[PDB]
Amino acid sequence: NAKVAVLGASGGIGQPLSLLLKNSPLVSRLTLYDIAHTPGVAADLSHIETKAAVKGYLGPEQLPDCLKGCDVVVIPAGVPRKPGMTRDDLFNTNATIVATLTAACAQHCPEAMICVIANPVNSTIPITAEVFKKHGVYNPNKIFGVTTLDIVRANTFVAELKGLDPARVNVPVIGGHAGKTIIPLISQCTPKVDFPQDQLTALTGRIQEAGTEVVKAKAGAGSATLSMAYAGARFVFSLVDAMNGKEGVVECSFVKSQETECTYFSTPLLLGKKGIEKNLGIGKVSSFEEKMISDAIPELKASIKKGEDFVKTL
Amino acid sequence: NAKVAVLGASGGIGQPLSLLLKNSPLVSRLTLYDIAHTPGVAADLSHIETKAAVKGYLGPEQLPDCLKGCDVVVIPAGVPRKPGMTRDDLFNTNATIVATLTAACAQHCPEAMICVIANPVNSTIPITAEVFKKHGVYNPNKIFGVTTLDIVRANTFVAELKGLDPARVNVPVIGGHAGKTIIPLISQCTPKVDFPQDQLTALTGRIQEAGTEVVKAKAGAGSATLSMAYAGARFVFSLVDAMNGKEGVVECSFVKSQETECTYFSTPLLLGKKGIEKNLGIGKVSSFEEKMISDAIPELKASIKKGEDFVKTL
Amino acid sequence: NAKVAVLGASGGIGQPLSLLLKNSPLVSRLTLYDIAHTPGVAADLSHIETKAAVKGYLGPEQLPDCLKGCDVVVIPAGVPRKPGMTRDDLFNTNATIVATLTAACAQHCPEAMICVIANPVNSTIPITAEVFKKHGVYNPNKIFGVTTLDIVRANTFVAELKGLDPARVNVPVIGGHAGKTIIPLISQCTPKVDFPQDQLTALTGRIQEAGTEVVKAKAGAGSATLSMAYAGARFVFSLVDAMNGKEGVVECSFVKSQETECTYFSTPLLLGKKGIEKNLGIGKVSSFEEKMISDAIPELKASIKKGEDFVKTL
Amino acid sequence: NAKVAVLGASGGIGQPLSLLLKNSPLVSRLTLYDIAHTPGVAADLSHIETKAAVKGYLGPEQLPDCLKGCDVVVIPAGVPRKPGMTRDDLFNTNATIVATLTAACAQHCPEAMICVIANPVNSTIPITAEVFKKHGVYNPNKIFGVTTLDIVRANTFVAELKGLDPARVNVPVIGGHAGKTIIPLISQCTPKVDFPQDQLTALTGRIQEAGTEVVKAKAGAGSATLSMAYAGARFVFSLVDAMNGKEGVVECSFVKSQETECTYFSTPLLLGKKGIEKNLGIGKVSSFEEKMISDAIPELKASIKKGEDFVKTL
């Protein structure tokens, strides 16, 4: 019974994301927006033999019609990295894109859940929050910075190393979504896994730099797209299941947080009909993980401020 | 336990196709091949938290390693249509691509199911079979021209018209995969549907020009990609199920046929452990449908001969 | 002070062609048309320090404006070959394009010189003509099939073999613009050059399949663009000098001709103030060249007919 | 008789750049280099009827042979801006490229004139200089940051406002190549022009942000390509004319400088057979212009520092 909109639906991420969404019996209405190529993408997906009615929308003039009556909005719209770039080098470009798109959501679907994929998530969620404030519709329980791909990677890597089924592995990942702000809580991993500090340090670095590993392997042809489409769909499915009253649905996401001195932080979250039902916090951690959290906060605060500062200048 | 190869994995069809395969618990190994970009696509997909081991291969030297030990090979490689073009206009381009890649399959995984997506299917399948004949390993029960998207479209359109759930609609589609060679047997639809003639005619034509409809909408950005990924994945899963012993798996597909005077033809096929268990044939059709079959045989024969001739001229 | 229009200006040929035209003191107004990207291209060129004013038009609504008051119109618009394709494979797409564009030329700038680059030239010129006849403004002295790249190539290939300065070389080339219809009259080359038969065969072969050797080297990335931008510019410059009144300006081009039983043919044309001043005809040829002319007529006649018969279906 | 190398020859700038170079009798050998597509660009150009011997090279393995015996090396190789990006957001990506290409130049053609187009120019020239210093072959008279397009834009806008022929206009532009650092000395224009302060500030603004405007106009399709090919060809031509002993050849360019407290700076340059013959200096400037210089200096210093610091990390 759910209506989902994808803003940036024509991109590397947008298209496979929209495919996974079209395939799902959770979605009953799928609206697709972009500045380019949307009608062709929409006609393509509309042929798939599932119940979701698909409709494409092109240009800022048609953005309002797209957002009308939306339960959930996902935002891959944005520019991806090239080899060498940091996530921060994309800031100027993506800030503008996010501000414009979130404003429309604020005006035309303020009760919707907003899932921002565009980078850097550490700054673009603050932008989304303030933009919603500036239109007087802010609800911190419905704005999500999608960090799911970090969890998905953590699970895959730990599964590979221990020879486990990655469907049975669950690694909480907290903090933010860039470099050393990504903190894998291997001590909270289910099932429990024992590593020497040797491997545990590499495993942590592997998770932190996984996004850059992929950018290097694509040699200028973009960043993670297919895996991100999987993670983005997974998060939307969790969210939509929770909104149908499924119980015990937990996902980590970058949101408005009380858990630290940082006003935005990613922790595991109990999702429900409200959006965020309850924030489960950092919980019990190892010294090594405590350390990483302390180091990450400086950088996190800078990125949050940078986002709030940008909204002031509109 | 299925080991699947995708040849043309970096393209518009191949990337999302590879994603759907990677997500499936039916696939235990996913080997990807292309002449460009493959290692980035594999890196990206390798991070998804499912059991299938992903491996990328690039260039002719690496093709035999992609194909070794494979149960199924999907071949979406090939040049897509631009607006105005027929599928036949791609022939000279794609004939060489398909001949080369099928020669490699015949050499390195002769016992695999070979699923050709590359257009024009009405000609590229005959090419595939003649290549396997020159290598002395032609098994006509394992070579499939993937027509599944024509069935997926038919199901969607019928359901849209009658207000049904498309998951519950099943339209056999026969003949070939180009214009008037696409023959949707609406009279054999489950559930039985009755349409006034004017609606039945418009529906039948819409199914036939569905691909051309998507090319127009995309305005030179290519042909159907996301829905073709859906259709090819569906077909591969059907094949794998049947290989795992599942009973009553029926899919339409353009194969070696003696149902009409055409050497190749698409009809419903019961699949089993060794590919085609039984060609279920045309069955009983309406006169309208009888007329489209008569009208399609000339074009089909020409396209078959065209393909056979290409392998002759070598 | 010639007013030139480039239809298809955002393309691989269209862009560098537009650069060469912008760079010329002959051009006072450069109007650029395409269905995509034309505003960015126009803005780009408008920064160049030449006097030509640049204006960019987008989509068929703005096509009339683009052609208003034009003296010469260049049509590189169309779709390029991929490896393996013949020029004939592009017929369906490009015939529709040329017919649509030349229809507006005929409506909005009937007096202008019309230079068609879009392949297959052997068919697209007849189309242009039959479209102009249909609007009752056909002037056979103003419609040119741009065969210049053949000449340019021939000059270069002769000069590499005789170690000559290609600037001083002039080989006339007659017939059409596809495979065996391209007839390089080496016997009429200035300066005079003597080759044994085997070298004369291989040289002529090289000239005929040069387009295809470039399509192979580009390996999917399209056909000749830069050298066709050069050849196109040269012809437009030649044409314009004559319109200003320069005496003795001769360029080979594929036009309505009565030299052979083929109703369209390429020969050296003396250009003047009203288009073609005088068709200079074949002239003196060798035995080898008479063999090639006679062998070529059947293929030209067919391509001429395909083009003519296409306009009837409109 | 000059032997020019183009690194990044397959790009949007590189291809038209390479064309203009091939069209000049000043060039005897044009070696083209890229990581992709160069063979097909080379073949395309090799057909043009001018004397330049064209040769394609592909991948870091062939780079050394591209550079042997070269007189001028031009480096447009790099990533262009998207809308909203500053030239400096490209630093991390383009620094690595420039450092690697210039490293090869230092080993294989240390005596050649090095013309860097890659952005951000304010930092890439320092990178080149320091890479050349590491290999003990630094000559500050031979390393140029192509600011030429800034001058070409200044000429054009001034010529539009005063109804002049832009070919008879020269505005010196000084400082650097990014935002406020671009300082067009309108007071030193020839022929003399004077604008009211309100028109003068707007003109100055238009020149400073001209590159960003073309990016805006292209809506994500890249940055200025054709005009940059013009500006870069112009510069190489000036540099080759002077190398042949021509006199009175003056071009602005960002080079090693002591005209200000900036260690690198752009001012008009007298060019001769050793490269830089004489720095002509800033000259007499208005209050408005002197103020812009003062404001600019801290930004240039930072950009220069950024580049130097990068090479210390290798």
Ligand SMILES: NC(=O)C1=CN([C@@H]2O[C@H](COP(=O)(O)OP(=O)(O)OC[C@H]3O[C@@H](n4cnc5c(N)ncnc54)[C@H](O)[C@@H]3O)[C@@H](O)[C@H]2O)C=CC1
């Ligand atoms: N949070 C995460 O885990 C990850 C985030 N990303 C981010 O996702 C973003 C998108 O990545 P890709 O899809 O690969 O890039 P892409 O370049 O392939 O596509 C971007 C899409 O955004 C669209 N777009 C740009 N401006 C728009 C606007 N104003 N309105 C609507 N659409 C607009 C473009 O038309 C294009 O279709 C990037 O910023 C990337 O950094 C990527 C991977 C993971």
Ligand SMILES: NC(=O)C1=CN([C@@H]2O[C@H](COP(=O)(O)OP(=O)(O)OC[C@H]3O[C@@H](n4cnc5c(N)ncnc54)[C@H](O)[C@@H]3O)[C@@H](O)[C@H]2O)C=CC1
């Ligand atoms: N049977 C059907 O129902 C349908 C068939 N198609 C066909 O699928 C083919 C691919 O379409 P798209 O993926 O959209 O095109 P695309 O251009 O996006 O991708 C083509 C892929 O084939 C690869 N390729 C080209 N030559 C190759 C070679 N020699 N060896 C290995 N790979 C090679 C390219 O590198 C690229 O990865 C086309 O022929 C298209 O007409 C498309 C839709 C439906």
Ligand SMILES: NC(=O)C1=CN([C@@H]2O[C@H](COP(=O)(O)OP(=O)(O)OC[C@H]3O[C@@H](n4cnc5c(N)ncnc54)[C@H](O)[C@@H]3O)[C@@H](O)[C@H]2O)C=CC1
């Ligand atoms: N006669 C000759 O010697 C040569 C002819 N050609 C031909 O030139 C044509 C174009 O080649 P490229 O520029 O390389 O192709 P391209 O694909 O790079 O660009 C073609 C341009 O035409 C435009 N276009 C497509 N449909 C249009 C329409 N309906 N109305 C207006 N514009 C439209 C496209 O948007 C694009 O800007 C091809 O047919 C190619 O075969 C190429 C080389 C030599």
Ligand SMILES: NC(=O)C1=CN([C@@H]2O[C@H](COP(=O)(O)OP(=O)(O)OC[C@H]3O[C@@H](n4cnc5c(N)ncnc54)[C@H](O)[C@@H]3O)[C@@H](O)[C@H]2O)C=CC1
């Ligand atoms: N100084 C100026 O006035 C201007 C500078 N630019 C700069 O020019 C540069 C190139 O721009 P475009 O050609 O339009 O972009 P593009 O993407 O069209 O060109 C990229 C080219 O660089 C090549 N490349 C990338 N890495 C390479 C490497 N490691 N080795 C060899 N080639 C490599 C690519 O293969 C491609 O051929 C950009 O940095 C852009 O910001 C653009 C306009 C004006």
Ligand SMILES: O=C([O-])CC(=O)C(=O)O
């Ligand atoms: O690295 C990028 O640009 C995209 C990203 O966040 C990831 O892949 O995790």
Ligand SMILES: O=C([O-])CC(=O)C(=O)O
């Ligand atoms: O039309 C194309 O090129 C692809 C195709 O076969 C379809 O969409 O049915």
Ligand SMILES: O=C([O-])CC(=O)C(=O)O
């Ligand atoms: O091959 C093509 O499409 C373009 C052509 O006619 C040539 O390059 O001579």
Ligand SMILES: O=C([O-])CC(=O)C(=O)O
């Ligand atoms: O803006 C860019 O990226 C290229 C540039 O420097 C210009 O056009 O002046």
